[PDB]
Amino acid sequence: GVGSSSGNWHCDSQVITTSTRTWALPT
Amino acid sequence: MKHPPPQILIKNTPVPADPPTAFNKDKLNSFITQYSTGQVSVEIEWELQ
Amino acid sequence: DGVGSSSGNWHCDSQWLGDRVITTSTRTWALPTYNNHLYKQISNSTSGGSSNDNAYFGYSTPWGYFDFNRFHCHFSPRDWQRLINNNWGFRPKRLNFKLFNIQVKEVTDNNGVKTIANNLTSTVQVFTDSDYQLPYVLGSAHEGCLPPFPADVFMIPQYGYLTLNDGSQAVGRSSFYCLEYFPSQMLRTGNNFQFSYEFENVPFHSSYAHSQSLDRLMNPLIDQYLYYLSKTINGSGQNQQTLKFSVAGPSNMAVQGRNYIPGPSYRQQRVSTTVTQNNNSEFAWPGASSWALNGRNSLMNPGPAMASHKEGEDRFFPLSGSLIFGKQGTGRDNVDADKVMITNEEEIKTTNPVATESYGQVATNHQSAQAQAQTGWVQNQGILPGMVWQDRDVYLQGPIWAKIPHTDGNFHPSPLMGGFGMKHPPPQILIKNTPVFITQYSTGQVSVEIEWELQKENSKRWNPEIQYTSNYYKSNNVEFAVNTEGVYSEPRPIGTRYLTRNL
Amino acid sequence: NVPFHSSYAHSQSLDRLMNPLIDQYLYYLSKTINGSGQNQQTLKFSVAGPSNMAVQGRNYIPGPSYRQQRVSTTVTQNNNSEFAWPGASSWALNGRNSLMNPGPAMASHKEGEDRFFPLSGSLIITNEEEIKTTNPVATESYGQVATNHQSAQAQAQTGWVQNQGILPGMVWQDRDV
Amino acid sequence: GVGSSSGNWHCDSQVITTSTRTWALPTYNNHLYKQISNSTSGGSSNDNAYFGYSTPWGYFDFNRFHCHFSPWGFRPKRLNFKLFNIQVKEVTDNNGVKTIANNLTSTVQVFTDSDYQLPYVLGSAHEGCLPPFPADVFMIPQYGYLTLNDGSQAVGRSSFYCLEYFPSQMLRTGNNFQFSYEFENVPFHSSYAHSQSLDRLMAVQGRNYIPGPSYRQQRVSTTVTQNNNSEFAWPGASSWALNGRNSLMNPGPAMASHKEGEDRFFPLSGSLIFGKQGTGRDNVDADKVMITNEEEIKTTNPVATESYGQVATNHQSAQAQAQTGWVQNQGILPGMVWQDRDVYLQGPIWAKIPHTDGNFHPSPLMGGFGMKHPPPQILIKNTPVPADPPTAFNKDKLNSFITQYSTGQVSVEIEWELQ
Amino acid sequence: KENSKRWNPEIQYTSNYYKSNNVEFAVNTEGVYSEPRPIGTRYLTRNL
């Protein structure tokens, strides 16, 4: 919904690597 | 790779500004200025030797 | 369901599975407010109505409507190529219409520059007339369709209808329809709307051209056992009357007895694309074929299905006889011939009479010792037992279906602009914004899905067919593609008839 | 087991079924000359739309006609001659000429003229006017047909259709009970 | 087997007719498919231009009634066909005299086209039928077909068919061939003459129904002094133009040949004309031909040489007299009734309704039963047997064959339903 | 089969609409069959 989070930030490397970033998309 | 990680395509859905009140067949050339932001997570498993 | 949850996905794909095709189109639309939420009586008398043939009376409504009735709505140029090269026939089966991602916007014009923001509590009304109680305006080939190229965003056309008129005035027998008097589902920003429809059974459209002509069906090697009258006289002299008979055979095929004859004809005037061949006079309306109904003259357009020209004469076309499409970016009024695309039904020449030719000749008198045989030209011919004919071809830019008028009788209801006649065609879909007045408009998505039955070409023809194809070429732009401005264009009308059959 | 007999009058006409607010995507030939003079030939095309509703493309056409002679109740209007038998529309069978009574159902008269009636068209005097929406008038020609090929030498000519058999895409109303 | 019969002779009518005949099949075009056209046949006339192919194949035609019949309503139901007792003769010329000997190892190919993929030539009323008398031996005609043409040329849309490209059944001398066929439903062909007429069920009275359509034919007297002294066989005829080609309107819409008491006349192209036994091919007098008449249908059908009626051409007023004009051609009007054209002992049985978007009253104009799926064509040829090859390999196909022909028996059985 | 998403129509192999004495890939008036041109297999397209 509007007032909730659809995902949690994950940024760790275990071998399993994980990345997370913030993006901006124009038109 | 023959079947590499696929392309991931994204766009902002266009939002038209107020169209005329009499009908016109042309496509709409006037949109609301708009942009989006968000988060991207990518998790790759790797094999070691 | 939610304001922050999208109520549908964007589906734009075509699926080919054996004998069926499923097309799916999705478009972004914008719905304004028409007539300031009012119903307003309209007639020619508003515009002044100088002519009786153009006299009309009707109403305009606050409602809009969705029109997918053209083929390029549901087919890409490639899928259309993929359809017409491989198949002898097709026809619609099912329909599924969805409406979603509704967004109602509210406009504020405050001092210099106007401001737009969301109205989250507003609704949009949509309903379908499934009982066919409203005047049916879809089969009239009006503009406003879902745009052929999916990245375009289209504006919804205002709904309006006509009823009986006497000149510009109404009459007691006229009707008036309030669309608010129908139950209609109301939709806020989180709601969606969908309904499914089942086409009534129609014949396959014939996407093929005969490899034979009606008059050549004979065995060229063998005589008939019928006779025809070769001589009525012995030669130069007096009192030479005789009766002489010959077998009809490969030598003279014109006189042979035949089981079936070509289809009906209502003749059109002939115009050449080379202007100096045309007569130097204004004959566009005066020299045109037409029919009169209750004092009014409706031009006969496009008319019965008839071949546009004789073999080898492509420069001629029937005056009102063909469907003519505009090129992309062509004006409304008095454009040059190069701005329009004139479709020609050459493929039907084998069984259909030329539109600009007489049907034939008949005997006009009784010959006798005192009177010669006389004939006269047949300029129009109605159905005779033993006629066969082809309907008008369908085009990528052309209509799909029409509503068969509700009458005590009809003959061969196939609509004259081409396509599938149905007494219960796809129902009209009416939509409007709910009044709140506050300046307000809505937008959203529309997806439509048609299932298409196919008929496979089984032919034993040895030599290769004619296929619709894009020939190798090098130009600035790609055909059926956008240019550097982003303007999509269809360069030519594409017919459906390439493969062949025997007659 | 017969079809229901229709007992209603259409609230629409065959030639008005269009949407009055919208243009067609079809074109028609609007103008064949740029002006007055020699060698002015051109082809100009325009969009069919609400301002000119005569030229619009239509999918269905009115029913068949076999024309009747027109007779006025006001007696002065009628010609002073005995045209009752000679004028009458007839059909020949085996050499016997029978009157075409009533014949193909058609609108008895044009809207605004209820004084006139088909000579042998109507039952006796009822009128069929309810059907003038999809049916051609009994006392009027079905329409016009081109009778030649125009050329730079020969101008376009049309004749009149006094009778038209069935065509594909015709609709009509039967006669009222 | 080589010495045993593969079938017998059945020739009786029970309603189940059964015919049996003996046929001879030659070698056509020396096993070649040859392109034929009007120029090939001499050309000249535009209305007569054509383009097509002649095939090595022959075909069977029982489409006439005198094939199944010895001298109210009826219609065919089932079909059954057999081809048996095959015999293949070869021919060799020593000097100027010819020898005939059995060739036992040769074959005869036959197939039926039941998907209707070939051009259908059995509806043109050609010669080559089974002979009406059971004792005769008949020559099987050659199969050829026409396609699209412009003048004597071929347009790109023209089709070429190879009948070798069909699967076919191959028969040595002991083999036989058979298949059955189910006629699709047709209305009974009426076999009665109305005792009443359409107008007498008074000239001014209101009626519920009116006579069928008409396309006027010019009228011709068998008393020649009555006829105009000029050549009007083509100039005075009724025609229909298709793609710029004028074809004669023949026999045309079903109409009564003549008015009551006018037996001598006949509509120019309006009737079926048969030849008498031994009649010549060209310019034979009126007593060498049997001219059928359609006077039987004159009750409900308009005379072929007469106008359908009169119609008003104007609006009368005190200034203008009521005017009429003649109707030569009148198509279907709601309320019409008509009778189709009658069938004859010599006449055809069925035709193939062309495959089109639309048709009205598909009954064929020469008479008989219109079928969208009529009895299928039955194709036959003698398999080529080559002569001695050159013994050094040559790329080219072989053009030297043994002379040959075949003979055998045919039986066609049709169940007829009577009303 | 091709699943291609190309919007504009392909190049196809086709007979021209032509007016000729003979038709292509068929016998002539003497019964001689001919193959007028060599026909390749490559008409439809793909992404690389």
Added chain:
Amino acid sequence: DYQLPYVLGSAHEGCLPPFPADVFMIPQYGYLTLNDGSQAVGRSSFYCLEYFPSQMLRTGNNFQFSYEFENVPFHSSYAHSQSLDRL
């Protein structure tokens, strides 16, 4: 289904930034077709991305997909100690 022109293997900018706290702009997608020059041939193709089925996301919606890599050899992260000629 790999039906679009695949532009990822061209070593373009537009990547996720190496330091996890940087906010990056998403690069524009475009593709090249056959050309004889600045012009196009009849074999040149045009793709519309609106003509694929896609998922529409408001502010509450999310999107995930999983992908298996096909079998590829281990990239060798080592240097040889011996030389081919001195073996």
Added chain:
Amino acid sequence: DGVGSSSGNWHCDSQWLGDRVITTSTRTWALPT
């Protein structure tokens, strides 16, 4: 099986079913010594 019994028929057609096509050709040959 005999002298007067045909040992085979003539097949010349192509069938298209799904992803496969079945072509059948039949020809007459002549073998010299």
Added chain:
Amino acid sequence: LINNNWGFRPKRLNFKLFNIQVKEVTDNNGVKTIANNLTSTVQVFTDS
């Protein structure tokens, strides 16, 4: 085929030889006679 498909390849092969006819030739002076030789054989094998 080539208009509708991205690729093709053969799968199965079924071969048949039948209706064998052996002709013996007798040349005498200018004329030559060709007649059936009924007992004659043809040799055929495949190298698999």
Added chain:
Amino acid sequence: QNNNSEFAWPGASSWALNGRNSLMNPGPAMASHKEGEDRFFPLSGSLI
């Protein structure tokens, strides 16, 4: 546009085997000509 000399054999691409020279025909798969140049074909590089 071609040279006025006999170069069919002397100008050809070839591969020698056991001392004998064989023409390279048609050879590896390569485009017959550079775009806009239909007129040229490789000497042995095509099938004729």
Added chain:
Amino acid sequence: QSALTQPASVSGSPGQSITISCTGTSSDVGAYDYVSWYQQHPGKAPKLMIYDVSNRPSSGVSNRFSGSKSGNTASLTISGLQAEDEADYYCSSYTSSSTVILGGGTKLTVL
């Protein structure tokens, strides 16, 4: 190379077939089937009628025109002569030296 040779004028009465010939060497008309015919009216551009010896263009040419070739000579046959038919006609061929050569043309008059 050298030009194709044609008769200077030909005339025929309306409705009767007429033939125009053009002769060439063994290098042009004789060696190839590349022969075309053009019809020209005064003050206008030439219009293609026959190409590839006997082929006609898909539109604008009636079936009354037919081309033909024998040996070193090509021929244009017009049947059912009409007033529109009278025009100037040109033979044209592709020579051995990869160049295009035409005939001198023949003027046809219809009586």
Added chain:
Amino acid sequence: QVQLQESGPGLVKPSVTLSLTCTVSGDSISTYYWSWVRQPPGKGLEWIGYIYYSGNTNYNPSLKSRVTMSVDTSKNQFSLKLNSVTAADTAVYYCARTHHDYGDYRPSYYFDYWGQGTLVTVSS
């Protein structure tokens, strides 16, 4: 709907090179050959030469020494240059498309479209 249009001088003095352009409208230069044909008044047609979109050119042997042609695909037009024009050069010059099927090795000998023509006069 290919439509050719050419433009140039009416009158030209002797010994001066003549330049003429032809603009293809409604279709592009594409893959076709493009020819120049001149007709002297009351004389037969003569093929000057043609050019191809890639600049490959072929010319009439008699006029070959002094004739240069150029194609410009951006402006969608092609041109002709003639050196040392004299009395003989006076002609109506047509620019005609020459049919060519891209990709097969078939000579392109015939002209399926034509320009209106331009009259050029060589005189002092």
